[PDB]
From Swiss-Prot, chain A:
Residues reported in the UniProt entry to bind Zn(2+) 2: D116
Disease: Genetic variations in PDE4D might be associated with susceptibility to stroke. PubMed:17006457 states that association with stroke has to be considered with caution.
Location in the cell: Apical cell membrane; Cytoplasm; Membrane; Cytoplasm, Cytoskeleton
Residue sites binding AMP per the record: H75, D116, D233, N236, Q284, F287
Homology family: Belongs to the cyclic nucleotide phosphodiesterase family. PDE4 subfamily.
Positions of Mn(2+) binding: D116
Protein known as: 3',5'-cyclic-AMP phosphodiesterase 4D
Stretches assigned to the PDEase domain: 1-326
Annotated phenotype, changing R176D: Abolishes homodimerization
Positions contributing to Zn(2+) 1 binding: H79, H115, D116, D233
Organism field: Homo sapiens (Human)
Record: residues binding Mg(2+): D116
Function description: Hydrolyzes the second messenger cAMP, which is a key regulator of many important physiological processes.
Length: 326, 323
């Protein structure tokens, strides 16, 4: 229980960007999603607010965590835990104080926890091009993200797993709609449109008497939560470098395994997936320049100046990867 | 037979005796009408479809329409197929659509309601059904019709697209998905709005033939075409229309009985103890069907005139049955 001692100390960092999430995964016996979600629910008093029985919460979290694949290098329970914790920090930004209801906060955190559950470690395009059962089920449209939702919600029906048992019917209906809207927005094929829309919101931003964002209709509220969880999902390059490099190692392993399957099938290999013609560093610089920095610069503008340190880390990490190329 | 062959000679006419064909074919209207249309359009030779594969697939697809559902069954599928087939021949749409596009619209029509349980998307969502859980409350039925229609191609000797090339299959699949998802009635208003916009910006030859240069406009027309076909019952000869009304009302009343037995709020038009069938048809025509078909008729002006005339006659008749 020295191990439990150290785990408890590490979970004291749950409100901090840069949590030692890989250490928590080891110290908790490969239960980072369970222990980080439980910590955040206690920190936000969500069990009391929503009358969630503790044993039900733990049972659901352990079953949800079990349905992430332990043999996928990137899209596994550690990624889920990281996106949950990152969403939890973004929800606490001063520019959003008292903006979201407890139900919206619960939706964003739950959506983050389930948002990649049962991910097979290959992309939507691979699933479509190989005529997979998932792509047949979902008509080639947000194939993975529709699946993550269906699994995350189906698991609430397992024994002693219904963590929403004491919500009203209107609360359950609202939560389900918001969770669906959020997880579907994590489909990377939606990124350009989602960013375009966020830029429009920044350009037309309204702030209250108190200085917080004014969001007075469902469309604006859900758009901010969609972009919040998308930013959390695309947060690896904004983390301290020792965390970022481990995430890069993991995504490259997953990509290379996909590319090996493409090469064996005689398919064209997807970008970044060819281990015999990879440039890992150039790929991260491009990822930051074309995707991650445009997104995070816009989020930082929305909540200015709250996210300045995050943006500074992203820019430093870009400079570091760039410097390894020449 | 023989009478069935005589009935099928009207395959190119609005008002085919589809119920008679259902009876004469041993409850195989979808198979015999699809087979007839693939011949009339030379689609088996154009796409190198083996006739036995075609028949095997059609019989399997038709088997996955429910025979105990009064409206959304194989006779409705056959009717929508044949209606699309006629609309594809609107003179104003001449030279617009490729043969792959024609194949996609016809195939989409055939599968567009397969495995329909006879209850609405809202019912499926509110009863927390397995389908709504699978599809995240979004176009629940239409996603399932697609998934079943395509999965059945994988049954033994059922792949009617086996000799399409790789790109053709991918393009057909995309178009079919885009068309069937557009048949979700919750999308009607947006679809009609886009049809109106196309009518306003419409470009035609000197003889009034539609010019549609981009895929977006062409798939919108195919979406509205199959939606018109899906909503064509009130434009058919009255003896046909009244049978479709009887069937949809039975299906609605059965859904309302389930909603009552479960203690749910009964859906509009679904309460057999508080129904006005005729007023509901007049409202359906006034608010949904006639705006849609008037816009279609403007897009193809004036080739839809006879269809629109029948719709207007039928509206007048149903109104006269209200005291
Ligand atoms: C640490 O490094 C990485 C992490 C991740 C990715 C790529 C990384 O490094 C190049 C890709 C991003 C992505 C793929 N397609 C996209 C489209 Cl189409 C739009 C936006 C983002 C993406 N991911 C999953 O595949 C998410 C995690
Ligand atoms: C013969 O008479 C009928 C036939 C049909 C319907 C209604 C009829 O008579 C009132 C409804 C129409 C419909 C239901 N919700 C809609 C929405 Cl939300 C928008 C547009 C149309 C609809 N259908 C399916 O349920 C299609 C067939
Ligand atoms: Mg994902
Ligand atoms: Mg339908
Ligand atoms: Zn993710
Ligand atoms: Zn239909």
């Amino acid at each position: 229980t020295e191990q439990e001692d150290v785990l408890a100390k590490e979970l004291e960092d749950v409100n901090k960007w840069g949590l030692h999430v890989f250490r928590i995964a080891e110290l908790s016996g490969n239960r980072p999603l369970t222990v980080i979600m439980h910590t955040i629910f206690q920190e936000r008093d969500l069990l009391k607010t929503f009358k969630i029985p503790v044993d039900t919460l733990i049972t659901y979290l352990m079953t949800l965590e079990d349905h992430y694949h332990a043999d996928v290098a990137y899209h596994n329970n550690i990624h889920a835990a990281d996106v949950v914790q990152s969403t939890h920090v973004l929800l606490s930004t001063p520019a959003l104080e008292a903006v979201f209801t407890d139900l919206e906060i619960l939706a964003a955190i739950f959506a983050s926890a389930i948002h990649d559950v049962d991910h097979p470690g290959v992309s939507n395009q691979f699933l479509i091009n190989t005529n997979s059962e998932l792509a047949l089920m979902y008509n080639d449209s947000s194939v993975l993200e529709n699946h993550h939702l269906a699994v995350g919600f189906k698991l609430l029906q397992e024994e002693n797993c219904d963590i929403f048992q004491n919500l009203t019917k209107k609360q359950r209906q609202s939560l389900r709609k918001m969770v669906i809207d959020i997880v579907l927005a994590t489909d990377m094929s939606k990124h350009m449109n989602l960013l375009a829309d966020l830029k429009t919101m920044v350009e037309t931003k309204k702030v209250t008497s108190s200085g917080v964002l004014l969001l007075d209709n469902y469309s604006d509220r859900i758009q901010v939560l969609q972009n919040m969880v998308h930013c959390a999902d695309l947060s690896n390059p904004t983390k301290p470098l020792q965390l970022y490099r481990q995430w890069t190692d993991r995504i490259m392993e997953e990509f290379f395994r996909q590319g090996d399957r493409e090469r064996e099938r005689g398919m064209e290999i997807s970008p970044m997936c060819d281990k015999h013609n990879a440039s890992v560093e150039k790929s991260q610089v491009g990822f930051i320049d074309y995707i991650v920095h445009p997104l995070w610069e816009t989020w930082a503008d929305l909540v200015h100046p709250d996210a300045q340190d995050i943006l500074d880390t992203l820019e430093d990490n870009r400079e570091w990867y760039q410097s390894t190329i020449p």
